[PDB]
Design a protein around this ligand. Sequence first.
Ligand SMILES: [Cl-]
Ligand SMILES: [Cl-]
Length: 162
Amino acid sequence: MNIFEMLRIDEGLRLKIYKDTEGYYTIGIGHLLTKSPSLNAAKSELDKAIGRNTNGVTTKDEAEKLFNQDVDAAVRGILRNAKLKPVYDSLDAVRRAALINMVFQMGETGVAGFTNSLRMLQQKRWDEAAVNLAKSRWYNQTPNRAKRVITTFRTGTWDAYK
Ligand SMILES: [Cl-]
Ligand SMILES: [Cl-]
């Protein structure tokens, strides 16, 4: 397993514009287009993202290209974030993927706010971080996914995804 496969499992793949768990327009593999309620606004961002008149639909290749870009951007954002980098640097490979997953979902700013959890992860206090992480809106809103990610931090294995 690897980060791509992990995220493809968590986000799925949709080739037509759709609304995410929060009601926002998205496309592909969890690529958020806009938080605006307007579908036209969404089609416009799509077109801008793809570089053609899409009319709300993408091909598999195009969606995978957005995904590649989004994963890359996620890693890069972590490595440039003062609160995040040190955490990520301290982790083993599997766990780093768990961190990336979270930043892809919630943004780096959103993850950088789990201060308490981050410290625990940095200290390698797995069970404790797992419990702290669960005390969040994130876990209450998307519990199955949060649970997989959390298990991943807790165990350092991919069992949650097998
Ligand atoms: Cl883009
Ligand atoms: Cl979920």
